[PDB]
Design a protein around this ligand. Sequence first.
Ligand SMILES: O=C(O)[C@H](O)c1ccccc1
Length: 315
Amino acid sequence: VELTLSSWLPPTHAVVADFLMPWGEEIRKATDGRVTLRLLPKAVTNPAGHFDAVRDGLVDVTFVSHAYYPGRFQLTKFAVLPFSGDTATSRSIAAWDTYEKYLLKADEHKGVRLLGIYAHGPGIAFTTSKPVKQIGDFQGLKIRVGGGMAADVAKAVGASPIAKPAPESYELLSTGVADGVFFPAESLVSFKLDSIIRHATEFPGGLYSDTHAVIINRDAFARLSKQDQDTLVRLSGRHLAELAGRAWDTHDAAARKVLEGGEIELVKADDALIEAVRERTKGFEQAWLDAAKAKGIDGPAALASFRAEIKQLDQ
Ligand SMILES: O=C(O)[C@H](O)c1ccccc1
């Protein structure tokens, strides 16, 4: 069985080059070639369309951003709140472990098999020409966001979110439609924004983050032997979360040569700015609790579990 894989990111991106490709090699080797992943040479549809591409059987495997589906992945938001996680590795592992233990029964990923979830690193506020040093500096900025938490944060701090998938960021910024972008560090470089962006403000534990899901068509999974199904599952979940998180973190760290290099004015959010953002976003947790209750899950348990686990990992 050869599983087709569609990606809406360039093949050189961390997610593909340093996560999905090595992961596919792990699957091949662990099933003696009986299961392989074939990366299709083009995206088969637009980024948000990738969930349905899998569900409809157009491709066997993909990754989807939880930000790209307004209303549909509300339960993932516990993992991406402002100021909550130092690295993609710790957040990915804690996000998956929490989702697997408490949230799977809510069926947010209806119609496909959910293999695993990961998160990227700390979100940064990047802008083309306008520094962000006090809360008022966000007012009116048109900021490209994925959607989801990034969008919730942009709106809360008084910016005007432009919710579009990541690959649109270069066009929107280069043409001056957007004033800025919420991205993790690596994206500054992989999306080729570092000759446009001149300003960045970093926040302890991130301004926000985003989670992705790796999914497989259910009929395709059913084509594997029981042993190979078990193997694919063993190589997914927490194992996948760690593999992906490590890729993101490695790319984030590489990107610091550009962040720290002098052409970008690099700001560390001061205590006043952080507190102003906390104050604007203070209701987000209760919003998530309310959604958790609506979905029939143990909100306080899941939230407490995630926090305990990420705090420990981060140590
Ligand atoms: O901002 C987004 O669109 C999303 O979080 C994302 C997707 C892919 C790379 C970086 C970030």
